Amino acid sequence: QTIYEKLGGENAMKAAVPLFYKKVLADERVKHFFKNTDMDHQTKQETDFLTMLLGGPNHYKGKNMTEAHKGMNLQNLHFDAIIENLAATLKELGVTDAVINEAAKVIEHTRKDMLGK
Numbered sequence: 001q002t003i004y005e006k007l008g009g010e011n012a013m014k015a016a017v018p019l020f021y022k023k024v025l026a027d028e029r030v031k032h033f034f035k036n037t038d039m040d041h042q043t044k045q046e047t048d049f050l051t052m053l054l055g056g057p058n059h060y061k062g063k064n065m066t067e068a069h070k071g072m073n074l075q076n077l078h079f080d081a082i083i084e085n086l087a088a089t090l091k092e093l094g095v096t097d098a099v100i101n102e103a104a105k106v107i108e109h110t111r112k113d114m115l116g117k
């Protein structure tokens, strides 16, 4: 039972990423980083990336997390905002605290790869 299956699988991931961007694009800490971003593209890459990371099918063909955030010099408060918004998204979707924590603990290992790049 992967975290991906525990979340609800493909249909849950497809609903979670656009809901998570609705919250991120309203969050003053981070919304502006996406000002010039093609959000259809980003939603597709990030859905593939989180599906792969959480134990679903691995079809992620994009950049690693250092290259993806290169030149942004991202700060700790920006990564905390992303995790808070992903957690709030999964809660709103009906995922249990225990599963949200499993998912955040996997994604948290990427923090050192993207901060300050």
Ligand code: HEM
Residues within 6 Å of the ligand: 030, 033, 034, 036, 037, 038, 042, 045, 046, 049, 061, 062, 063, 064, 068, 069, 074, 078, 079, 080, 082, 107, 110, 114
């Ligand atoms: C730390 C706060 C973060 C901010 C502000 C942020 C912002 C961004 C931006 C602005 C881009 C795209 C540059 C462009 O193509 O338009 C991007 C790419 C990406 N980010 Fe983040 N990101 C953050 C954290 C994360 C996290 C935690 C993950 C996943 C766990 C993630 C996964 C990705 C992926 C998969 C891409 C696309 C790479 C590709 O297109 O090859 N990001 N991010």
